[PDB]
């Protein structure tokens, strides 16, 4: 019976859980005020903050960091690498650290993890962080010889949902081909062929349909010509695209169970905007499929959205039911992906990976294949 | 027997063609290079010299221009409408003079065909603009309440092959649902519904698959940052995506021939290139599928590159063909599109259209889905 | 925005959640020893023990117990009754607290949740009991007049598995035969 401790740092909350075996025994979110938030200047500055929480979360339980298997969290804005279970090492907080490949709540994770362990002696564990990039080099080329396709999206529920299609069906997840679509603040769109997601969207740098907080993609000629007239914020800009607009913007509220509401009640400037969203997330999966030539299993809705059983769902389904069956697994839960993926490794189910190494065999083949 | 004249003004060539009913008795391309073309601050100037060589055209063959049934030439950057046959009216040469929605060598094209109607009191015709619009407002919304999917794609060609795929199989465009594909030096897809291309890319704004010579669609965050930081040339920019992108930016190659040249010399990178580009192709067409939810008849592959079928065409056949059977149809005879099209309207086959009221109808069921007006 | 505290008693252990609307904020599963457990003869007599752990859970959050819209506990040893939500009236909790129909740490939840209910003025409800009843009658003949087979299962998980499965298949849990089978402490 191994115990162990996930941490889930947010934009604005963070999450805790405690799990024995495949038992969660206690989790909490603790939300933090944009009145608190307000406080620091960077991320890597909030860390003693949320550490401070992670701490007391375990006090008021009667347990004691050295009373844990392992320290698991969520894998932060890492270099690209493939999937799977990463021991929190050196290099990899050097580079959450620094901030090199931006910065997010998420780094912190990883850092909490770490000295906790270096505090008790536990290993301290990542699972499927947001850069996983195993896609093949055709899906890299972008049509601009500057710009390439990065592979950043929701890696570990995707890895996760995918593994448990897999399971309920007693096959394997190499052993298959999905199109999963985690529809949730951010949307991803992943080709899954033979437990390797080839090719996906970037689910940050405004790519791929709308979310209910994004605006996706858009036409190039729209954008760099409204880039120089007008609201030169080289910053505000950057943030009108992934946050400022998509569902939220031509409805004003971000929530889909609202909408829903408006839809029912009548609004049908709110029906046309969120059936537009259902549209898209269409198109994409009709995209992957393409990508797959057809050989489908499965099509998997996962997320937040996954929920959304009325209008969403249905809309879609309708749509791209013609490729594969359409599974539907609600919401995404972090923290049960992170405890088990860990519990997994404990038990020599699964073999643990090194981030150092496994970050360089990767480099090398983005930084030697593609040249010319 | 109605003798037609069509006239397609091009960027750096200009083509017309005669026609006796369905049979082309005459077809000339005349191209100008840049050196002669560098005379004309813009493009309107050009008339002038267009039209020089439309009437020597006419003249070289001993006709006049009072021996024609009619004046066809292509579309113009003129306002939203559906597709069919306009009749070339005041309005249409008013917004294609003012340049109002952009100028590009197309506009020249409908003028010209006016005045010889104007000179010999012969109908003067356009077909499928490239403005063409019959999308559904679905399609409309691109995710930010400022902007909007615009419907410019070759609906000329696309129109045309639409139909010769219905009636080589003797059935009616209007009961069939195609996914057809454009594939030149620029590139759009379409999903037609029942005669109507409820959805397309912009194959001018920077939007689909990448061509042999654009950029096609590139994430928002890697643009918005390298826009401020490094080459500020508010212009340059705005040509390094419909124009300095694609193979021609990676291989340095407009030319397609020439590619699947290195490609079998063994040249390792063109091929990833190439692949790249054929790989976007197909996932567009799956794009386009799902908005026809499965329901296709077949897959049209249309356009210049639809030629190369060694490496492209198959490579493409292989990932959508699950969807519906593959058809190819080669290049796109333009001169045939705006020919048969006048002909037809000539024969009562079909009725002409009037730009004026038509583009209004549009711009009325347009303002009204703006629920912000 | 409603707050809801879940309350849900068991034989060994005692599970808490605070829930804002759809989302779950805070969970935790307090287990109790054998040795803890043994000092008590009857369940109804753990009581106060359960009860003095679910303030606790609240308190230790900031919230208060008026804080809450509702309070929600699993349906005890009830009189056979259909499926749904009720409200959690004396006569309830007259009967849970007889033990008219057996004993069981399921009966004190209803009762804790009516507590903190008369204690803040906020609704206390229960969701389909173990003792919900949808069987033909063909079902409850048991072979001797006297006796009558009863449904008392894990109502609660067993329709909302049911549920899920339906749902993970765009189907509807009423055009479906399901042969469910919840293996747990009890087994159903």
């Not at 990899?92 to 362990?117: C, D, P, Q, V």
């Not at 030539?293 to 791209?320: C, Y």
């Amino acid at each position: 019976m191994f115990r162990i401790l996930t941490i889930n740092p947010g934009s604005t909350s963070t999450k805790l859980s405690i799990f024995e075996d495949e038992r969660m025994v206690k989790m909490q979110n603790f939300s933090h005020s944009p009145d608190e938030l307000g406080r620091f200047q960077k991320i890597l500055d909030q860390l003693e903050f949320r550490e401070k929480i992670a701490r007391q979360f375990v006090e008021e339980t009667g347990y004691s960091l050295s009373s844990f298997s392992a320290f698991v969290s969520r894998g932060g804005l890492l270099d690209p690498i493939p999937g799977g279970v990463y021991l929190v090492d050196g290099l990899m907080i050097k580079t959450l650290k620094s901030g090199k490949n931006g910065e997010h709540a998420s780094n912190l994770g990883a850092i909490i993890a770490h000295r906790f362990s270096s505090e008790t002696g536990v290993p301290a564990y990542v699972v499927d962080p947001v850069v996983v990039d195993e896609m093949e080099d055709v899906a890299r080329v972008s049509g601009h010889p500057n710009y390439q396709r990065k592979s950043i999206f929701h890696a570990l529920n995707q890895k996760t949902v995918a593994k448990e299609v897999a399971r309920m069906m007693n096959k394997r997840y190499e052993e298959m081909n999905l199109v999963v679509a985690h529809m949730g603040g951010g949307i991803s769109i992943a080709a899954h062929r033979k437990g390797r997601v080839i090719d996906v969207n970037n689910a940050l740098d405004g790519d791929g349909p709308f979310t209910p907080e994004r605006s996706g993609t858009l036409p190039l000629t729209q954008l760099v010509d409204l880039c120089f007239s007008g609201k030169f914020t080289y910053e505000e800009m950057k943030k009108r695209i992934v946050g400022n607009g998509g569902l939220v913007a031509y409805l004003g509220t971000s929530d889909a169970r609202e909408v829903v509401r408006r839809i029912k009640q009548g609004d049908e400037w709110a029906k046309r905007v969120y059936r537009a969203m259902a549209y898209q997330i269409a198109k994409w999966i009709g995209k992957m499929a393409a990508v797959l030539k057809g050989e489908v299993d499965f099509i998997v809705l996962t997320g937040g959205l996954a929920h959304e059983k009325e209008f969403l769902v249905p809309w879609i389904t309708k749509r791209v039911s013609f490729i594969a069956p359409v599974l539907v697994f609600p919401g995404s839960n972090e923290e049960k992906a992170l405890a088990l993926s860990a519990l997994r490794v404990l038990r020599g189910e699964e073999k643990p990976k090194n981030y150092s190494e496994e970050s360089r065999r990767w480099r090398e083949r983005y930084d030697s294949y593609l040249d010319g």
